[PDB]
Structure 1
Amino acid sequence: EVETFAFQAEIAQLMSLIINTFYSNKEIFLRELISNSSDALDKIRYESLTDPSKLDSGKELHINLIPNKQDRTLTIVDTGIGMTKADLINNLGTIAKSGTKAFMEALQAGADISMIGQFGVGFYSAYLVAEKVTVITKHNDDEQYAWESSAGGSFTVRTDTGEPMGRGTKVILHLKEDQTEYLEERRIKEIVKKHSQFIGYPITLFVEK
């Protein structure tokens, strides 16, 4: 069964602001998601130092960026720690509520949307460029899940029966019609170099086709 959930009103409000604010500097979505990847790869590596079996679902620690012009998707893939169903439905939203409030106050005081990552809610910058976001994820302790949302106040979760990933997270950005620049190899390399050049994991940019 596909389960449908309501976001918290605060998360829904942050999502509308991201969607609705005039703000040209949309490219920062990408460092935010790569930085999320990097932090998740730090967590699995750190956990595997006192428990080596945590890497039996895959030893390689890396980030892939995969454009697809036909589907109009940019996918950010990591082999980090992954997320459990409790993360997807409850834990992450509980934390997000307070980083939301702070981010919202900061914008009023004169901060801008690019600073979102400082408030633990940078994931939502995905909606600068994406009309829908699908998150596929598998943690050692749980099953493989698909989370999805096009904003509008709700998200769904379901067991994922697609191709098993081992361990880690794929964020599939279904791009808005006017943001297909983020599918172009030269544009992605530009942004990675500008904002993500010191990530301590190999980042592979796949090419089409």
Structure 2
Amino acid sequence: VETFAFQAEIAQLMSLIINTFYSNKEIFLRELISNSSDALDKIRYETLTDPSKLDSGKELHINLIPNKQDRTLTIVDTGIGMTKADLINNLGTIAKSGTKAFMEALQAGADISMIGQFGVGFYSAYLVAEKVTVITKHNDDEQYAWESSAGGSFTVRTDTGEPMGRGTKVILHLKEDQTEYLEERRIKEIVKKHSQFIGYPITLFVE
């Protein structure tokens, strides 16, 4: 198990998110589904020039799996996935995002609301989760599990668990007061309101 520090600005962004009373928390699901769609688009385009890219799995979809017993909501996609390097760089640093302008924008006009337009939508997961685990398999690497309960650091380790072929699974370990996101009716309404036009099947697994 390797432990890494988040880039300073990401750590600051996470604390803000972690501690906010921002009301419209449901946007977290929109952001994760939008990230999954992007990942699926990526593997799908690459497969136009090289069909063998789908040897790890031909299905392109997104599944939502609430688990009331474990208090987890899991978002699984079969997109392009992430290499170890991608995990460390993309979830650990500002990378390609507009993080700095977002951090500045506490004086522009928008609050916590425009996160997704600044390329940092992923972190909205911390509005509802005390901890996030990301399990991922990219065609070019082994399967890895990234995890963080914020606080400034994250871990990365080889994942020997159930093989996924290719894709990314985000497991949200929900805060005790955010269990509404495990309710079928709530999940349905959020998908309909924010993600209805996503170009891949989004399937809710009923408990």
Instruction: Tell me the matched-pair count.
Output: 207
Task: Tell me the SS of whatever aligns to 1:117.
Answer: helix
Q: Is the 8 A contact 2:28 2:125 kept in 1?
A: yes
Is residue 95 of structure 1 aligned with residue 94 of structure 2?
yes
Q: Is the 8 A contact 1:132 1:151 kept in 2?
A: yes
Higher helix share: 1
The answer to which of 81-90 and 124-133 deviates more is: 81-90
Q: Is the 8 A contact 1:66 1:205 kept in 2?
A: yes
The alpha carbon displacement at 1:114 in A equals 2.3
Q: Partner of 1:42 in structure 2?
A: 41
The answer to which of 109-118 and 197-206 deviates more is: 109-118
Q: Is the 8 A contact 1:10 1:97 kept in 2?
A: no
The alpha carbon displacement at 1:115 in A equals 1.1
The alpha carbon displacement at 1:168 in A equals 0.1
Could you list the runs of 5+ residues in structure 1 that have no partner in the other structure? none
The alpha carbon displacement at 1:98 in A equals 4.9
Q: Deviations over 1:171-203 (max 9, x none)?
A: 000000000000000000000000000000000
Alignment CA distance shift 1:155-1:96 (3 Å) = same
Q: Is the 8 A contact 1:96 1:120 kept in 2?
A: no
Measure, in 1, the Cα distance between the counterparts of 2:161 and 2:91: 24
Q: Deviations over 1:81-119 (max 9, x none)?
A: 000000111255444475211111223211122210101
Q: Is the 8 A contact 1:96 1:121 kept in 2?
A: no
Alignment CA distance shift 1:67-1:133 (3 Å) = same
Alignment CA distance shift 1:97-1:9 (3 Å) = farther
Task: Tell me the SS of whatever aligns to 2:187.
Answer: helix
Q: Deviations over 1:118-169 (max 9, x none)?
A: 0110000000000000000000000000000000001000000000000000
Q: CA RMSD in A?
A: 1.2
Task: Tell me the SS of whatever aligns to 2:146.
Answer: strand
Alignment CA distance shift 1:202-1:91 (3 Å) = closer
Q: Is the 8 A contact 2:7 2:94 kept in 1?
A: no
Q: Deviations over 1:57-91 (max 9, x none)?
A: 00000000000001100000000000000011125
TM-score (norm 2): 0.97
Q: Partner of 1:19 in structure 2?
A: 18
Measure, in 1, the Cα distance between the counterparts of 2:135 and 2:128: 19
Is residue 109 of structure 1 aligned with residue 112 of structure 2?
no
Task: Tell me the SS of whatever aligns to 1:111.
Answer: coil
Alignment CA distance shift 1:4-1:134 (3 Å) = same
Q: Is the 8 A contact 1:11 1:97 kept in 2?
A: no
Q: Is the 8 A contact 2:97 2:120 kept in 1?
A: no
TM-score (norm 1): 0.96
Alignment CA distance shift 1:96-1:124 (3 Å) = farther
